[PDB]
């Protein structure tokens, strides 16, 4: 059956975001007028948090704990699914086609994604999601 | 006069002596010495030419800027998109096989200790 | 029992729904309605592993055909090579009973 | 270390099978 559910971790392998870990927010298997193909509305993170040591200051700790996300429409053929699942209450319906057509709305969406993913990284789970892929 | 002559003191048709014929505004037919054509960069995994990257001679790339020499992607300007996709797939599947093998080793150890006890 | 494999493949393609080729097989697995997958022996290993990962996620059964792509195509009855094939509907074949 | 979180056969070869496919080789049939 359909494994490309809402809360589903994948990784983008083509484009500027190749090899970047991402999570689905809304699947569109039939496709809209624009994008006449099966696609997904997804949110990932561009720059992953950096490792922290005891030899550097608190401001540096915070700065390398910061996270910068991205939000995107991406083709299923350019995804490759991951068995893992990320459940986020903040990322319920943050993005839609209207947000991806209105630049202000997508800017607010990236701010929200940054806040929620920073909160989970501070919580301390899904370290596989928050670490970069080695390829 | 419709016949020309060399003007670089090298009288041999070597690949470093490539020339072409021009007609000057003075009405004379003479030769301009040309340089070698630039070669397109190729991918590292396969030998396909990388699209988007000027085909110039080596030092010329020093004058052009970084974005004119690259493509905004991992391994951009060194490997093609198909090869990058294959590398991502291979890395993920290698990690998956490692996880599966570790699960099998744990199950085998559990069976061994269950048989022992 | 490869003779039986070929006979039931011919029957299932004559009765039910069959798709051929990597892109069609991958689209069927993504749709999650494919009921059987066949992967040829000479299929590239990365392609094979990606297909097995997809089938494991979709819980769609997959079988490794003994012969190569040309043999799989000949058994399936068409005159071209088929590295991977997917069966969406069994028609009236017992290929899925086992 | 395999650090984990805190939250019908697929290969259907059509027709034990391993024992009856191994002990049924040419040399065993020949003896």
């Amino acid at each position: 059956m359909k494994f490309l559910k809402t809360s589903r971790v994948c990784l983008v392998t083509r484009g500027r975001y190749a090899g970047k870990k991402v999570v689905i927010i809304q699947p569109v298997d039939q496709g809209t007028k624009s994008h006449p193909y099966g696609h997904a509305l997804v949110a990932g993170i561009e720059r992953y948090p950096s490792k922290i040591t005891r030899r550097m200051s608190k401001a540096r700790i915070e700065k390398r704990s910061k996270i910068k996300p991205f939000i995107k429409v991406i083709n299923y053929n350019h995804l490759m699914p991951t068995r893992y699942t990320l459940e986020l209450e903040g990322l319920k319906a943050v993005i839609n086609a209207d947000t991806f057509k209105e630049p202000s709305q997508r800017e607010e969406a990236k701010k929200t994604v940054k806040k929620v993913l920073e909160d989970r990284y501070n919580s301390g789970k899904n370290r596989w999601f928050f670490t970069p892929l080695r390829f | 006069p419709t016949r020309v002559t060399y003007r670089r003191r090298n009288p041999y048709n070597t690949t470093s002596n490539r020339t072409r014929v021009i007609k000057t505004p003075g009405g004379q037919l003479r030769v301009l010495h040309i340089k070698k054509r630039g070669t397109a960069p190729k991918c590292g995994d396969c030998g396909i030419k990388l699209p988007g990257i000027p085909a110039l001679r080596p030092r010329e790339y020093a004058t052009i800027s970084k974005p004119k020499k690259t493509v905004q992607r991992a391994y951009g300007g060194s490997r093609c998109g198909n090869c990058v996709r294959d590398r991502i797939i291979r890395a993920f599947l290698i990690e998956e096989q490692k996880i599966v093998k570790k699960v099998l080793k744990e199950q085998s150890q559990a069976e061994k200790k269950a048989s022992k006890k | 029992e490869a003779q039986s494999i070929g006979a039931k493949l011919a029957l299932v393609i004559k009765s039910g729904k069959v798709v051929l080729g990597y892109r069609s097989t991958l689209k069927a697995l993504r749709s999650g309605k494919a009921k059987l997958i066949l992967i040829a022996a000479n299929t590239p290993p990365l392609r094979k592993s990606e297909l097995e990962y997809y089938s494991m996620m979709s819980k769609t059964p997959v079988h490794h055909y003994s012969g190569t792509n040309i043999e799989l195509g000949t058994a399936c009855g068409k005159l071209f090579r088929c590295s991977t094939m997917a069966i969406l509907d069994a028609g009236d074949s017992d290929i899925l009973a086992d | 270390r395999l650090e984990e979180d805190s939250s019908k056969p697929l290969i259907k070869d059509l027709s034990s099978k391993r024992a009856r496919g191994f002990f049924s080789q040419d040399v065993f049939q020949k003896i």
Binding site: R83, Y84, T85, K125, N126, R127, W128 | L93, I94, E95, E96, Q97, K98, I99, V100, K101, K102, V103, L104, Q107 | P45, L46, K48, S49, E52, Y53, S55, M56, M57, K59, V62, H64 | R1, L2, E3, E4, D5, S7, P9, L10, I11
Partner: peptide
Amino acid sequence: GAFFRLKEIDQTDALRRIAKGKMAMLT
């Protein structure tokens, strides 16, 4: 170096675990 293979995982509680797919890291 080896790729994913379903033959040595089939019909197993290990296959059940893999199909469950909880967060897993090999360190």
